[PDB]
């Protein structure tokens, strides 16, 4: 299947309370593999997946340099944006950045991304063509003009089509025993009387990977979409995911209902009946 690598960065100003908090995380697909935290003791990029630990000292040194540089740029940028917007020094502000690339099953480049936000709203984004920018407001237009003058877009494209792709490809091979696996959901149904005349049926999917899954309820074969409560997909804490769907049914009618579970790790979709 297709794969992705993403880095997510958050810097938050802390007026009166020292330097901004900087937190960086890297992902391959739904799996986190590196982190940097400015308040942590190491002051290094750190491994968060087994398969990255075998990268040598020069990898860790370089990634650490990259994080310090990102940190420092964000710090100056918090000041810059505060000036563009005429904001009070008293307020806490946030810069977030995401970038990364997607590859197909043959490792070929599908698309790249680079997007910046200020205080949780779009600020400036690289367009899909990897040659132009979308600025969200008048302040971001200043940045757009600057990044045009310094040919930032070409620099991003070089990264996104090159090292982003090369890195992801190496990671997918090195961590193939986990990144290229699919853990099918462990499924079961539970039953919870609400009264003598009603019960909840809950259809569970646990321990699955990757995160994408569909759970659907039927009554006599017909989808019950509107009546179905679906929780948001949630991390188990061990690298796998969880989800459930529930329906409220008339007591005595539980056996008319079925739950269908679809996941790429299943030989065939599963059907459950009380």
């Amino acid at each position: 299947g297709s794969h992705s690598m993403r880095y997510f960065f958050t810097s938050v100003s802390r007026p009166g309370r020292g330097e901004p908090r900087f937190i960086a995380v890297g992902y391959v697909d739904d799996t986190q593999f590196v982190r940097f935290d400015s308040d942590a003791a190491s002051q290094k990029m750190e491994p968060r997946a087994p398969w990255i630990e075998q990268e040598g000292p020069e990898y860790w040194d370089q990634e650490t340099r990259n994080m310090k540089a990102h940190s420092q740029t964000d710090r100056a940028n918090l000041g810059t944006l505060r000036g563009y917007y005429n904001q009070s020094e008293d307020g806490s502000h946030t810069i977030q950045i995401m970038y990364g690339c997607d590859v197909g099953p043959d490792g070929r480049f599908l698309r790249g991304y680079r997007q910046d936000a200020y205080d949780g709203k779009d600020y400036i984004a690289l367009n899909e063509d990897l040659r132009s920018w979308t600025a969200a407001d008048m302040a971001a237009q200043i940045t757009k003009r600057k990044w045009e003058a310094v040919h930032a877009a070409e620099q991003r494209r070089v990264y996104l089509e090159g090292r982003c792709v090369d890195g992801l490809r190496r990671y997918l091979e090195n961590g193939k025993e986990t990144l290229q696996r699919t853990d099918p959901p462990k499924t079961h149904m539970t039953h919870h009387p609400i009264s003598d005349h009603e019960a909840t049926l809950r259809c569970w999917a646990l321990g699955f990977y990757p995160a994408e899954i569909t759970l659907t309820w039927q009554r006599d074969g017909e989808d019950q979409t509107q009546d179905t409560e679906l929780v948001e997909t949630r991390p188990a804490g061990d690298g796998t995911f969880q989800k459930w769907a529930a329906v409220v049914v008339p007591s005595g009618e539980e056996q008319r209902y079925t739950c269908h579970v679809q996941h790429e790790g299943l030989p065939k979709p599963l059907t459950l009946r009380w």
Partner: peptide, 9 residues
């Protein structure tokens, strides 16, 4: 691997 390039706003 992260992008070594940073840019001021």
């Amino acid at each position: 691997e992260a992008d070594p390039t940073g840019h001021s706003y």
